[PDB]
Amino acid sequence: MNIFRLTGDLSHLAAIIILLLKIWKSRSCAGISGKSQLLFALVFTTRYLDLFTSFISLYNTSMKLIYIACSYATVYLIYMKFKATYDGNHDTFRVEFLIVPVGGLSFLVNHDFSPLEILWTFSIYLESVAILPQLFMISKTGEAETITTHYLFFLGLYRALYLVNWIWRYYFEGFFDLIAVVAGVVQTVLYCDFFYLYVTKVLKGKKLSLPA
């Protein structure tokens, strides 16, 4: 553990709770891409199969279970409990264009040709593009509520802090994983437009339009 990974992980949990309580309290999933939430749920399901093979720490086990629980819980609120407010007409991103290529790439570009390693690699490739349906839906519809931009900020900030974590771990422990780093850089660069607009508009009381 270093303070970058921990703050990244706290940023990630914050993101997930904010989105969960926004939907819970307002009893609506207005402006939320169900499809992005399916992808995050699929990312945690393929990444955390090592719950069955490895005990790292109680923290590590706990967060994996919290992340899995909240991801499935968010998909439940969107597609069952509050489906009445699910804007299916504007959440039109074709997710097959992420899943099939990422699946294909996870099979051909990996550290090891075993089922657990391939599914991990899949989790890492998929997380890098998981937010595109959410960002596309905002580009399409008018704007995002303030609370949604805060979710996107903290989610975006989480993997940005992992990059710093990876700099720290390379310098200090000689640890490097180029599949996680490259995917991490893709994941983070996809938040650049949103980050700019969040700083210059949302933190200045303006709202955050992404034309296209």
Residue numbers in the entry: 1 to 212
Please share excerpts from the published article on this structure.
In the archetypal KDEL-retrieval system, a seven-transmembrane receptor captures escaped ER luminal proteins carrying a C-terminal KDEL or variant tetrapeptide sequence in the mildly acidic pH of the Golgi. Signal binding to a luminal cavity in the receptor triggers a conformational change in its cytoplasmic face, exposing a lysine motif recognised by the COP I coat complex. Hence, the KDEL receptor cycles between the ER and Golgi capturing escaped ER proteins in a dynamic retrieval process. Our previous work has shown the KDEL receptor has a transporter-like architecture and undergoes pH-dependent closure around cognate retrieval signals.
We then determined structures for chicken KDELR2 bound to HDEL and RDEL signals. These structures with TAEHDEL and TAERDEL peptides have resolutions of 2.24 and 2.31 Å, respectively. In both instances the overall structure of the receptor is similar to our previous complex with the TAEKDEL peptide, with a root mean square deviation (R.M.S.D.) of 0.223 and 0.153 Å over 200 Cα atoms for the HDEL and RDEL structures, respectively. Both HDEL and RDEL peptides are bound in a vertical orientation with respect to the membrane, with the side chains clearly resolved in the electron density map. Superimposing the three peptides reveals little movement of the peptide at the −1 and −2 positions when bound to the receptor. For RDEL, we observe slight movement of the backbone Cα atom of the peptide to accommodate the larger arginine side chain, resulting in a minor repositioning of the glutamate at the −3 position in the receptor. Nonetheless, the position of the positive charge at the −4 position on all three peptides is identical relative to E117 and W120 within the receptor, supporting the view that a salt bridge is formed with E117 on TM5. For RDEL, the arginine side chain sits in the same position as the amine group of KDEL and could thus interact with W120 via a cation-π interaction and E117 via a classical salt bridge interaction. We therefore conclude that both E117 and W120 play a role in retrieval signal binding, and the only major difference between HDEL, RDEL, and KDEL is the precise nature of the interaction with W120 indicating that this may be a critical residue to explain the differences in affinity.
